[PDB]
Design a protein around this ligand. Structure first.
Ligand SMILES: Nc1ncnc2c1ncn2[C@H]1C[C@H](O)[C@@H](COP(=O)(O)OP(=O)(O)OP(=O)(O)O)O1
Ligand SMILES: [Ca+2]
Length: 430
DNA sequence: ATTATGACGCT
DNA sequence: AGCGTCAT
């Protein structure tokens, strides 16, 4: 009733760059623009592995993880851009720097939480309040929402996509009460106005297009973002939740895409998020734990309280390389040489980070995978990171893992290593 | 023979 | 600490 929380206290957005690495390469090489194209890493093995795909290529069925040779079978005219290779490994610097471009623009509008290389959450609550004070009861023109979809609309008593968009937007605005400055629906709408502005600035100043979700929390914002890709934004109101969730597979919600989501489905014998409303909070806690149970109880009602964390920079800086099948490292000289290569890229990135961001990493994490292990990581050890020196870091990394060697022979390494990973962590101000 | 990342929860 | 899960 009057004490039942509705989770409408915040305005939160999720900005998601469209086929990001592809856009980066297309900006650099105009020949790739408006073409079926993909970004690949390495080229020797089956033409290389695809890590990003343009929407033109997706129409042919091209997907991430697909080998370029196989993608060509579906899309013979597919164009390709290769990830830069340095010191024998893929180097993602161009995309990290492009990410910084976008993140710094978004930061002008509000505090952001860097979710990934090309996603950021935004808490627009305060900005919306300010903007509402300028409007002063003034209605919101549909012209201020040129790329916005209102989920669930149109509805009630045109066969084209854009036509439908406008009809929904019209119904939404027609029902708004611009008279109430505390109206959640109004707040969401102003949030979307600001996101239009943010997305316009991103495209103007970088050339990159993106999609966005606007709602009352991170999970709904994220879900909304994916509803109308690419180059569009979607508003998901609290009111839209029941119908939206009624046919929404549980795996579509952030954090429920893996084993937990599978267990929710199996244990409860349900398929859709909405079906969760029929269980008490205690019931959910009993199956999935105190934390998960509470989260699920609230989430299926469109309520979540995870805050947009003020963090624009990554917490860690890591370098990793796989050594599949026959290429698995089997000698001591091999292991040492590749640790050095990884350590050299790491030193380079750490030094840049220290100059730009006034901080120093204090811990070096070393991870390896042994041939046969199904897990991505077989072992993880840490040592002190006291100096940004590649030779020292590689030596220290070898030291902490050198006893993983079974070979009675000092020169041979067994079982062969199929993955090396160096990660700098635990930053302090400098 | 996907690969290269990155954040956070559990114990 | 070291491992697992989930995500771009
Ligand atoms: N599994 C992966 N391995 C390596 N790189 C990845 C992987 N997933 C994503 N990336 C990289 C390439 C992507 O361009 C970028 C952002 O990923 P993601 O948001 O999942 O898709 P995308 O931006 O390419 O397409 P979309 O338009 O659907 O968002 O990060
Ligand atoms: Ca993206």
């Amino acid at each position: 009733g009057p004490h039942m929380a509705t989770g409408q206290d915040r305005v939160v957005a999720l900005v998601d760059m469209d086929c990001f690495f592809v856009q980066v390469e297309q900006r650099q090489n105009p020949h790739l623009r408006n073409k079926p194209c993909a970004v690949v890493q390495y080229k020797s093995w089956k033409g290389g592995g695809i890590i990003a795909v343009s929407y033109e290529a997706r129409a042919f069925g091209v997907t991430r993880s697909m080998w370029a040779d196989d993608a060509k079978k579906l899309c013979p005219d597919l164009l390709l851009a290769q990830v830069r290779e340095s010191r024998g490994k893929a180097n993602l610097t161009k995309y990290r720097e492009a990410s910084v471009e976008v993140m710094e623009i978004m930061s002008r509008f509000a505090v952001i939480e860097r979710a990934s290389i090309d996603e950021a959450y935004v808490d627009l609550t305060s900005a919306v309040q300010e903007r509402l004070q300028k409007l002063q009861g003034q209605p919101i023109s549909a012209d201020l929402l040129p790329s916005t979809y209102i989920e669930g609309l149109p509805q009630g008593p045109t066969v084209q996509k854009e036509g439908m968009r406008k009809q929904g937007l019209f119904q939404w605005l027609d029902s708004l009460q611009i008279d109430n400055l505390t109206s959640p629906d109004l707040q969401l709408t102003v949030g979307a106005v600001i996101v239009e502005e943010m997305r316009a600035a991103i495209e103007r100043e970088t050339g990159f297009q993106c999609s966005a979700g606007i709602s009352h929390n991170k999970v709904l914002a994220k879900l909304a973002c994916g509803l109308n890709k690419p180059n569009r934004q979607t508003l998901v109101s609290h009111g839209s939740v029941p119908q939206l969730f009624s046919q929404m597979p549980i795996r579509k919600i952030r954090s429920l895409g893996g084993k937990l989501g599978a267990s929710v489905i199996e244990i409860l014998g349900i398929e859709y998020m909405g079906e969760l409303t029929q269980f008490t909070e205690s019931q959910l806690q009993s199956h999935f734990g105190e934390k998960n149970g509470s989260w699920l109880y609230a989430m299926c009602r469109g309520i979540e309280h995870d805050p947009v964390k003020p963090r624009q920079l990554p917490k860690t800086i890591g370098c990793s390389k796989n050594f599949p099948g026959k290429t698995a490292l089997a000698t001591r000289e091999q292991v040492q040489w590749w640790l050095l290569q990884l350590a050299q890229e790491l030193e380079e990135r750490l030094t840049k980070d220290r100059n730009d961001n006034d901080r120093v990493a204090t811990q070096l994490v070393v991870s390896i995978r042994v041939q046969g292990d199904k897990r991505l990581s077989s072992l993880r050890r840490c040592c002190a990171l006291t100096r940004y020196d590649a030779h020292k870091m590689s030596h220290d990394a070898f030291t902490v893992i050198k006893n993983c060697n079974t070979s009675g022979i000092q020169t041979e390494w067994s079982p062969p290593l199929t993955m090396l990973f160096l990660c700098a962590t635990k930053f302090s101000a400098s």
